Amino acid sequence: PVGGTRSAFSNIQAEDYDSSYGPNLQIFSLPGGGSAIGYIENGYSTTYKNIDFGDGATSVTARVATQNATTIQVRLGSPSGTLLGTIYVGSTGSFDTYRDVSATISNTAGVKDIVLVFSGPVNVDWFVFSK
Numbered sequence: 001p002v003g004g005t006r007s008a009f010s011n012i013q014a015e016d017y018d019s020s021y022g023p024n025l026q027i028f029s030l031p032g033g034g035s036a037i038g039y040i041e042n043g044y045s046t047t048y049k050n051i052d053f054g055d056g057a058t059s060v061t062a063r064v065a066t067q068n069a070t071t072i073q074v075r076l077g078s079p080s081g082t083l084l085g086t087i088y089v090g091s092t093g094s095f096d097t098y099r100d101v102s103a104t105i106s107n108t109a110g111v112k113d114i115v116l117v118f119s120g121p122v123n124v125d126w127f128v129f130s131k
């Protein structure tokens with residue numbers, strides 16, 4: 001990726017946010033190594049600046065755990081910026097059972113700030129984009 005930037009196409013660790021909304025939000029260690037964000041509620045959000053999408057990505061994948069169906073919006077710039085897509089996360093049976101969940105996104109290219117907006121409790125280990 002371009003200087004000063006993180007690739008869209010390697011895992012973005014969800015705990016590596018530059019900015020966030022949500023008083024309770026926390027990073028939890030995972031039993032086998034690694035970390036995930038959690039204590040997430042409706043209206044919470046994390047922002048990841050300077051993602052390099054190169055000449056285009058059309059899909060997103062997140063490694064997530066939850067006990068109830070919820071969504072993660074993927075937006076540009078801020079929580080009110082352009083909606084690229086929505087990940088529909090079904091229950092995985094536990095906050096420590098992670099599954100990879102994907103969604104398509106509007107074709108996005110070049111360097112962008114990415115915002116994840118949450119509609120309910122979910123844990124997020126990482127997310128990544130594909131062409």
Ligand SMILES: [Ca+2]
Nearest residue numbers: 013014035125
């Ligand atoms: Ca992680």
